Design a protein around this ligand. Structure first.
Ligand SMILES: CC(C)CCC[C@@H](C)[C@H]1CC[C@H]2[C@@H]3CC=C4C[C@@H](O)CC[C@]4(C)[C@H]3CC[C@]12C
Ligand SMILES: CC(C)CCC[C@@H](C)[C@H]1CC[C@H]2[C@@H]3CC=C4C[C@@H](O)CC[C@]4(C)[C@H]3CC[C@]12C
Ligand SMILES: CC(C)CCC[C@@H](C)[C@H]1CC[C@H]2[C@@H]3CC=C4C[C@@H](O)CC[C@]4(C)[C@H]3CC[C@]12C
Ligand SMILES: CC(C)CCC[C@@H](C)[C@H]1CC[C@H]2[C@@H]3CC=C4C[C@@H](O)CC[C@]4(C)[C@H]3CC[C@]12C
Ligand SMILES: [K+]
Ligand SMILES: [K+]
Ligand SMILES: [K+]
Ligand SMILES: [K+]
Ligand SMILES: [Zn+2]
Ligand SMILES: [Zn+2]
Ligand SMILES: [Zn+2]
Ligand SMILES: [Zn+2]
Lengths: 394, 394, 394, 394
């Protein structure tokens, strides 16, 4: 009477019936019911109910009934305790905040890391680099052409290839367009080939890489076909396309999607927006305050000879002090503008220290997130897959 | 005789009666008393006293009796062990320093994070941003006006808006005062409205935000009403108020009290004064020593032609060397003053290394405190509240 | 029937026969066999099988059968659990990724840290510094000569020792060759002595230190013997050898192989190639993007008077912007080139912040690896060796 | 026969007699002896030996017998396991390196943190600041005078107080000597007073603070008494003492010995010599290598017009490159010398990255040591002392 013994894997557990009756609906509440012999396994010889579960972790679950607080043991992994409490019918959202972050720690990372007879032949040839042997060579050729185009784009801006000769203006070397045309013909061939053999055309269009590639390809054709009449409009649009040429520097992301580190970095960035917002707010407040202080401190040494007190200082006003504050708070220190008054040097020292602290605040959080994600992702490489040795249904 | 058995949740614990008698007053001391059968639950069939507690944590409490030292197990949370030792009557202030910081770790953070029929309608409309729908719009309007006033304050100091025309002096653009007046009429309206419908007027006055707002509002009225006679006094007070204009840059803190990160930062700053004092002392000692050394090192290359040996160096004396030491110890390095002698370069290298070390000493402590506070505070957002499932009194 | 009890070191474990039959081939599968009494120790009085193993760690192994997932307890060391699961016949490559990195953590470090009657007398005299008393003195003499040669090599490039006097050219001081000859005779003696008394001559040649030493010695002889005819060839080869003189600065690695810290650093570098690759890729992407942005941002303030818009800026093109991006992303900030336009300062601030983040990403991983390796290596110094007290075969 | 049962605090432990016989001399070896009934507590009714010890930690000690390896559980503190293994007679120096650093972790810190009827009245008045009420005021007066002397010493070097008037030379202001004399009379009084009432005079002399104070006091008397004849010797010694004046800046350490942070820093420095040596060696190697590389890289752009190729570069030689390497490897970047050739910029980038890595290697070790020491020392402030409630001898 009022005493019940629980046998969990050969380990006896003894408690009062009243304590088991605290939480209704749960399996233990069913066990506290007097007519539960036909429900659970029970032997009248020992008068103890039998289970088959981990005996070292049932203690915390029972202690939740005994006291009222739910905690997770630190000697077992999170998923193991989660499964164990799921079996007994305890809702996992009742654990105390003292031991919540470690509990829901691996699950978030795990879920974030996972968040026409020839059409299969053609589509797999261009998409998966290692689905075959030829796809590797195609990917390497694309890498070569991308690097060539980027190199040409960087060279076009140099003064050696832009002689001065409209009266004078300046012209780029002719072959710097021929190389670009050689790259463009291949890029057009590849884009046209893949847009035909892609299932779910609308999904293909919705992708950002495809539109980036199309936008990169278009200006060459526009320029080569728009060298005729309408002088004003032609000259405006040619300058606009000359500016927009930069979009072909973004094609490098097309072939770097297969690198593990970049995917880990992308997940880290997507999972750490709040820290970026916090860092931006901290920097804004610090920059504003220190710019105001450094502006007002440098006016002490104002010479009593000029109508404008800003002749002996680099800090003519506050907005120009924003730049100095940003440079100084990150320990960069270009040196183009620095305090020159005994009162300004104290503010400079304070600015340096405050910048160090306010930068060191959230960066460790971001770095820890990246480290955890990277470790988890790199663990997958060591263990490819197994053959599910544990056959269920004993 | 001299042998007793303790049953803690189905787990047998056996010890001599003498060991239980070490600590008087405690529940175990009562248990060691021969006439305790009427006090505690006891069955003559098994001759063991019965309890209902966690069996895996009673071992450490009993070991405290057995040896004399009190330690906390590392497989359970701090609060769980604290409650368990509280039940048995053991004072928590007796644990050894080897395992004290982890024990009293969550409690400090938890306590620090928590450290006229229309008057309710009016007061809640201005104070709580999200107590209703209109309060959100009022807060947004206040944000707009605050940003406008700050922008005008920053613009007033620029040279483009201060043409030179008393003989010449300089004047600010007229509309830069009209915008400020438009902001200040709203600010006056809001401040006057809230000061009427605030319960506990003295508490309202004691708040720093209200006095900041009043001090920000006052100078505009003083200037607009004090443009008359008494030329000397008027000209002095106008300059004084022109200086004090900066106080309206502090109203940004009025609406940032609702951001979680800033509250966490405030708690971190309030809980880490000792580390700031330590950092300041370290920096002072380093700056003094290295300024002296760099002053004395640069005099080796003194040219035997000038009465003052400080003509070939930036280090004319020690106080000017304070600035170089501060700049160099934080890896900032403006470059306005640097050593130029073979003996000074060694001191410069030593200064850089010592600065790195003496900065890296306490900053990790401060950062760890901030990280723990931020994690605990952010855990609250995920779990709003529950319905107290565990009904007491079994 | 369908119920079995396992006795592991005095601790009863109870489970159904069906659960033990999940994994075939394992020892428990043999135990589930009905005719296992003649195989394992078993007493009909208690009807329980007896073992001699740790009872606190068998629970997780049995739980692997009960649920299907394999985890490692956090209350015991990795090697202990590894040995325990090896005894029971469980393959260690089945543990979940949630608890894999900590499991295979010490093993990798441990394996990485371990990855003619006079010939023994002569060879040990030069190789092992502390195999005797004389070897210490020989090593010290070699250190002295190496330092002298390095000092002379550094001095040869100074202008004080290179007076101008072929019509003018320049000549080095004579004694700067005599000191080198004095060092070279000893180095030749040592190298000749060790190459004779080295077993496995081909292995000796395969070593990098020996070829480094030979390459360092050779140019002195070549120069001292090649000051004759064939003016053109002699003058070319003399300049080439003057350039190659630098190889004698690498002999310092010959005597630093015995320092523990350098060996730990070598192991850390060899074990962290992926992080270096990741860091290089991140830096390349950041430098490219920010160089492009800073080039395009500075052209806003182009003066409408010059054909080339790059007259008011340091950023004449993109390749020169690579250098500024590299300098700025590491918070170095020489200051030789900095933005001077309101649009360029925003890009500069973004570049500084992005550089800080992208550097702080993988460096903690590398540092953690070094710290673990160094701690493990320094643990060996405290404990030299023992006398294997535990005699096997009880 | 061949089977024994051990009762450790109510927990049954069962093992073969042969396993207990592995380690001789230990208490378990005595227990394996057949004639041990008269030695240990034993009851023939249960045929089990009884002990009074922690049952959860005896498992690892027994497992040491079972397998041969000794490990420490991670669920208990180091001192608890140390005491437990000390009781059973196991030498603590046999634990494996896999779990040695955490075991011997608290002990090292704990031991390092602890490594004439009026004579008691007088001596305590000057030494202990808070042994009384007057000692506090005496310490404050000493602080005031020390600060005044340091301020005067710093002011003496400024140009404002050194007018030019031997023909011209320069003289310091007269009162800058009177203030020093006022400080010196008090310092002499204090030093003379304490040197009389100090027990163990030789120990008093052996202290560094006393000799520092005496050396600081002496030059004032020497100067004030040595303004007479022997012009050459007087003028030499006066300059020497003018140089040695700096020793009075070190008296600040006299009163900072009572600050907790400085004592913690001293212990950290004394306990981390190896890391400093490692850091110095790393920096030396890096500086040498990168100085050589940057010297040889800048000679590519040598103009074919000058005899000395070092006219277009800051890197005239290697020793001057040492300074640039030191400045660049710490991300300081003064900017007084920087590469100006496309080949030198690559070396500069490599130097910056290598410097960051080689600095970030051992600094975390040093910082972790400081943090542990500081936490342990600061824990003492919270818990002053107790009254040893646990009375031994049950
Ligand atoms: C020690 C810490 C708090 C830093 C010290 C900051 C001091 C030096 C700064 C901060 C605010 C500054 C003052 C703000 C406003 C003005 C008005 C101007 O017309 C003259 C200088 C004067 C009066 C400044 C003097 C210098 C000042 C007092
Ligand atoms: C190697 C470490 C300890 C750094 C070395 C510091 C050396 C180079 C510095 C520190 C103190 C310096 C000395 C202090 C005082 C003077 C008096 C002055 O009239 C001539 C230079 C002279 C004699 C300095 C020479 C340079 C010096 C010895
Ligand atoms: C706020 C964050 C996103 C940074 C802001 C970057 C801005 C200021 C930069 C990035 C790209 C830049 C533009 C890129 C291209 C050109 C073409 C050039 O002929 C005129 C300037 C112009 C139009 C630039 C103006 C400044 C610009 C818009
Ligand atoms: C990519 C990594 C390895 C950095 C690249 C370092 C390169 C650019 C450096 C390192 C060593 C340098 C060479 C070393 C020696 C000399 C001899 C000199 O009379 C002409 C330049 C020359 C031939 C240097 C050219 C630049 C050089 C090759
Ligand atoms: K700098
Ligand atoms: K810098
Ligand atoms: K600089
Ligand atoms: K820096
Ligand atoms: Zn908890
Ligand atoms: Zn402890
Ligand atoms: Zn796990
Ligand atoms: Zn271990």
């Amino acid at each position: 009477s009022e005493r019940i013994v629980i046998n969990v894997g050969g380990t006896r557990h003894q408690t009062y019936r009243s304590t088991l009756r605290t939480l209704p609906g749960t399996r233990l509440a069913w066990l506290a019911e007097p007519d539960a012999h036909s429900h659970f396994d029970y032997d009248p010889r020992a008068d103890e109910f039998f289970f088959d579960r981990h005996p070292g972790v049932f203690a915390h679950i029972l202690n939740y009934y005994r006291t009222g607080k739910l905690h997770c043991p630190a000697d077992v992994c999170g998923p193991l305790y989660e499964e164990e409490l799921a079996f007994w019918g305890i809702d996992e959202t009742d654990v105390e905040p003292c031991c919540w972050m470690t509990y829901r720690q691996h699950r978030d990372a795990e879920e974030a890391l996972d968040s026409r007879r020839w059409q299969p032949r053609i589509w797999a040839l261009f998409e998966d680099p290692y689905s075959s042997r030829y796809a590797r060579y195609v990917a390497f050729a694309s890498l070569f052409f991308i690097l060539v185009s980027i190199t040409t784009f960087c060279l076009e801006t140099h003064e050696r290839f832009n002689p001065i000769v409209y009266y004078r203006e300046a012209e780029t070397e002719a072959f710097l367009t021929y190389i670009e045309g050689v790259c463009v013909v291949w890029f057009t061939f590849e884009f046209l080939m893949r847009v035909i053999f892609c299932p779910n055309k609308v999904e293909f269009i919705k992708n950002s890489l495809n539109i980036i590639d199309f936008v990169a390809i278009l200006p060459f054709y526009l320029e080569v076909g728009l060298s005729g009449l309408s002088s004003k409009a032609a000259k405006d649009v040619l300058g606009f396309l000359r500016v927009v040429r930069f979009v072909r520097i973004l094609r490098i992301f097309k072939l770097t999607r297969h690198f593990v580190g970049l995917r880990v970095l992308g997940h880290t960035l997507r999972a750490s927006t709040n820290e970026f917002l916090l860092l931006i707010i901290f920097l804004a407040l610090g920059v504003l305050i220190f710019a105001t202080m450094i502006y007002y401190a440098e006016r002490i040494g104002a010479q009593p000879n000029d109508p404008s007190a800003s002749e002996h200082t680099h800090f003519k006003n506050i907005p120009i002090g924003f730049w100095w504050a940003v440079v100084t708070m990150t320990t960069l220190g270009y040196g183009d503008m620095y305090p020159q008054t005994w009162s300004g040097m104290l503010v400079g020292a304070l600015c340096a220290l405050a910048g160090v602290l306010t930068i060191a605040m959230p960066v460790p959080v971001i770095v820890n997130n990246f480290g955890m994600y990277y470790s988890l992702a790199m663990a997958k490489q060591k263990l490819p897959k197994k053959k599910k040795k544990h056959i269920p249904r004993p």
